[PDB]
Symmetry: D2
């Protein structure tokens, strides 16, 4: 005998329903359909005994809008809990700060996001933490490289920007047998395509800036924890380091998450067609997209990717860095020559100009492409024009 | 041509316009999104260089609002666009601009309730004669045009009956009679119908609904087909001080980018839901342009592009009390509330919600029967929505 | 036996306390010290019978953040109720739309804000409403000019930009004896200096853009009603015309109202010193400020102005429009050559270039000055430099 | 020089800097306030023209945040400033930048609780030795400096004991020993004390408190005296991803304009309240720099400018239970909560609120007695605040 405002008892809401409504109910006070923005720093306590009786005290620790977004994200990624941060780098740094001490070993994918690599090497290594960067394409490599001091195995799939894949289920089985903490950066994937916590990962790190936002609008990070122990560790350290997400950013992201399925579907269809076009282009050397049949890790993509193969692709222009640069300089609108990725607006970039950067795969004129939701024919027209000008 | 430029001579296709139309990266910084000009006034370089940078006071115009207006004018296919705090403000500005004492205005009988009230309870006090006719037959509009008729205000689809109006034929009539044709295509969105392409002189939009699509902001838009009409709307907006804020314009610039995919999802869900309802035994009638039982299917196929929309309606067997039992028992993800066109599916019964004010006689005359229910379909999983509707109908 | 969160029974809180806290209590749900921003359009209803049981349904009609700001403003101005609008012009237009019909007469100060004058003449007169503009400096003039069709007496004090004063108590006595509705635009005054509702006015119109905001940040208007009848009329017509203030603007203004007393005190002290300096300046023809002893309506200023004489002044540069324009072009920072007024930033303007405009008093080179809260010596230095360059 | 330019060779005075410092009207539009760059990335003109407009990714830097940082560097008298999501983030970035395993850091014993915890519960795990000493005597700092000491972290006034530290003498000591002097002047604000003027190498601010002053946003600031220190802070902020958002920076750019008048009002109210409390028979002790009973009055008059601040403290006769009875019975306009420095007056008792965690022994050693109460004075009418305090003391 449920009424309006209640969910059907015994019904797990479907995926897109969760993206629309998950972790959010109408405001109890007013019935407001959207969460009010709690743009305030402190919360008045009713008494000394009733301290935190309403759950909040100070926004660096917790905020109702941020908490609503966290519950939504934990539900979307299938974790016990989630903590939101000012940036994705803040989330990664909070992971490294919480679960690594002097003497600890940490295995990181050698093709990780450049910021993750630089924060590990340039900063955290000063604390006598050993970061070893290996190829995660073969999970057996991860199994070999585990030492007794290994505390964290940090995977990324697909990797920024090489789009190399890591077998999250195999790596998670290895890590659970070896009793080492498995952290996965599924920013490029989005939970719509892959939920590492479903594949056995201990922690998921997300740059909500990318696809959670998907509108080039905010910065944010998320750490989704599978257990209460891990989540409490992360919550405590976030309060200590003061890198929590703001309420306004939480509101923006709560709005933009609702359309993540349709956004990612459109971006991925456009990306498939664009990668197919680039693979046929006489001016294009190599094309990297998990959806085209020549993808080297095709079997792992088909096993690990749900619904889509994503909006990220890459390609090499025949002619080296000079042809690549000429092409970059001659890409017209609606393409944008900038950084970031995962947004409605299609983005093109060249990490080589924006030895150490070829063993990764960021070769000469290696162009990274974030596909948006514009008309795919306009995107292909701009690409074709630029390629003919290369 | 180098990077950052559109290829000369080419035009962005539809969804490209929704993403990028009327907005370029910030010339000062390259910011891919337009900054939010949350400021009242603009410093002038000198007395002689007054307005040399185009701005002076945010009530008159604002850069964020202007970027949104360029986008909206591009999407709707008009010369210009002016943005307002609400859709009602856009309608009210139209009425205040183009009507005077002694003028005549043709309004669709099944117009949006707010339009009907604001014409009846307010502007009629200015000795302006408002006549509410059935716009379903363009000859009704043609016959009812007086020599004092200045504005013909169509709405398609209508709120909430979803009646259609032949915008092309009505525009032909108005052009031949030299009468302004204003069309409220809020329920249609420009992704399904652009009245300016069909000869309408003005389009009024409640950006609150689908332009937003997230239950986030209120807004309105007036898209003008000529420079003279646009200049009049601009002047009157400045005079009446009902411009849209820069924060709302930023929100709308964000949400408009996904309008095509949002509306495609809502329309697919609405088609499936209408087909489900047209076979439930507790349902007396189902209105959706995408099902064969639609009375104006010919006009719908002639006038609707891509989709048939995310709005539908249905009449429950059992009258008002059965409708109320269903409303009180419609579960989540549905929301019992007003507004429409959002990602969150919304259901309402105007009889005892929107029009618990109104007498039942002309409420039936205006089409809204007793068990009439308006349904805005969101982008949730259609199975959750259908299960909710089925349980609610079980309780009817 | 009151506890934390309650006010002392039988205590009317003092003025500055009302500016800080009036119309706002901690959020009942979370104890949040500031009102959450209800950035949502619709409000979910619990049932058909319990329609509007929580008070809200649609934001064009009403919004909790806007409602909180309205209660605060009604308390500050001493009225039964208040309605907030997108702009001050929207508030004035709502007044004219509600209380004027074809055939009605309306007395307006001839020195009213230019926007009020233009909306009355250019627009509302098309509805066969007669707007008569007379000199409100003598209340007897208002008494003479009242016809049987006069419905609204629309005063302004101080006037934009001539700073002419209108005797609100005398005009209100006249209007109450004649049974005509008295509306007052006290934007230049702020309730800290004058509350027309205390002086018998029927309606107060405020441009919250000016001093309520005081930070050049938002646009807004307010209509403060002395009776429930008037307030309900205004509320209904605001819902009809769709010119309500947004929740974000309400939040901004709720923040900026807290410092209105100290802001206006600082602006007014700076303005007094600046007007005294200008009155001694050999390059300055006339100086207009209600605080200097030569003010023509000095007695009315001392009778009607509380605490301060405001941050608005005006002056004429000796030499006509050419000297005025040279001075305007040679005013350095921190002065800003723009429009608007009442902000932290000091503003200078010349309405003559930014016959019909001299009977008002906007003479040749008539400079309007909005004084901010910068260091008064910097403001005087910039003015002195500009004047020597005139 | 024409309009819109500062007179060359002149410097704005204090309050002028608070209003206008480091911000000019928008070059594109003349917008008197800086627009809100609510955008993640910035479009580049070409490969060669990378960063030609100064921006690329908002985590690294953002135009609104940069305008706020210019303002803050001007106000505090530093070379540069970097803004963070919180004050704790600024402190944590300092610790992460300038400390390494085996390094030594001198921290005031009566430091802010968050600083104490983050040094003790986190960075000490990196084999960094944190020593908490009494900063009230600069010779204590001088004697305790090891050859491995890299940072000396002062706080003045201290939270919540309001102990002062001689920033000039400590800075002299640190310069002679070539040690970084970081000072947390959150409680002071630059309107009362600017540690960079007193030889400090770094100032850390919780902009949440007085910079905001409206209980609206969280933020932090690191103001660096040299280019090298500033560049290190900038690099590490980019690496740790704890930059301040553009909306928060806009709010803070708004609120900083009234910091002088706000702090003057709070300080006048605090003086009157301290004088009232120093004569209430239910009050055992009163700490405020502006009353004669202040233990460090000489340093206060030497080091405090304009005012003595809006923070005070007092110990109630009767112990913790009397303090709790007073806390539960302090009426509006007071608010029982955390945070400080806002327009709204705030009262707290760390013993059973902030430090219901802590053991009582070292909580007394760190100065906070049992009936200790911290009071942030707002800008309400001082009579309302005094009446509230008097009633609450009646209930003690
Ligand atoms: C962008 C990104 C990050 C960094 O997140 P920010 O919000 O920019 O700090 C980390 N990992 C991946 C894969 C990313 O794409
Ligand atoms: C919503 C609507 C309006 C009114 O717009 P508001 O934003 O609510 O003021 C007018 N016409 C239609 C068809 C509408 O749907
Ligand atoms: C500014 C002003 C107005 C107009 O208010 P807006 O917010 O600009 O629409 C009306 N009257 C006076 C006295 C004003 O100063
Ligand atoms: C508030 C404060 C902090 C912490 O700043 P947050 O914004 O709360 O992270 C650090 N030191 C002092 C003195 C403080 O008052
Ligand atoms: C009008 C009243 C809220 C609105 N557009 C609706 O249809 O609900
Ligand atoms: C720390 C904890 C909330 C904060 N700055 C305070 O002093 O309350």
């Amino acid at each position: 005998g449920v009424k309006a405002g209640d969910w059907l008892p015994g019904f797990t809401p479907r995926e897109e329903t969760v993206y629309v409504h998950g972790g959010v109910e109408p405001d109890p006070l007013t019935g407001a359909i959207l969460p009010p923005i709690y743009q305030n720093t402190t919360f008045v306590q009713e008494s000394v005994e009733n301290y935190l009786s309403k759950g909040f005290s100070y926004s660096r620790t917790s905020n109702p809008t941020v908490l609503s977004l966290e519950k939504k994200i934990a539900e979307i990624e299938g974790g016990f809990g989630a903590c939101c941060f000012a940036t994705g780098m803040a989330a990664t740094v909070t992971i490294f700060s919480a679960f690594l001490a002097p003497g600890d070993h940490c295995l990181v994918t050698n093709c990780s996001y450049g910021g993750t690599n630089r924060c590990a090497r340039l900063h955290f290594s000063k604390y006598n933490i050993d970061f070893e960067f290996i190829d995660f394409r073969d999970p057996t490599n991860v199994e070999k490289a585990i030492r007794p001091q290994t505390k964290v195995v940090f995977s990324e799939s697909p990797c920024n920007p090489t789009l190399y894949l890591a077998d999250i289920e195999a790596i998670s089985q290895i890590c659970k047998e070896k009793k080492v903490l498995h952290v996965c950066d599924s920013t490029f994937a989005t939970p719509y395509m892959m939920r590492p916590l479903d594949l056995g990962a201990d922690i998921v790190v997300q740059s909500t800036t990318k696809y959670y936002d998907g509108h080039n609008c905010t910065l944010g990070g998320a750490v989704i924890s599978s257990t209460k122990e891990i989540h409490d560790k992360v919550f405590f350290l976030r309060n200590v380091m003061g890198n929590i997400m703001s309420a306004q950013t939480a509101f923006y992201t709560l709005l933009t998450l609702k359309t993540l399925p349709i956004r990612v579907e459109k971006q991925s269809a456009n990306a498939q067609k664009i990668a197919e076009f680039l693979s046929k282009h006489h001016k294009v050397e190599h094309v990297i997209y998990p959806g085209i049949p020549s993808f080297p890790q095709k079997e792992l993509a088909l096993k690990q990717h749900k619904n889509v193969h994503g909006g990220m692709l890459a390609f090499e222009v025949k002619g080296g860095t000079e042809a690549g640069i000429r092409m970059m300089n001659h890409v017209p609108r609606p393409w944008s020559l900038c950084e970031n990725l995962g947004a409605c607006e299609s983005i093109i970039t060249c990490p080589a100009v924006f030895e150490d950067r070829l063993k990764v795969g960021i070769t000469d004129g290696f162009i990274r492409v974030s596909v948006g939701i514009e008309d795919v024919n306009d995107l292909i027209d701009g690409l074709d024009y630029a390629l003919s000008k290369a």
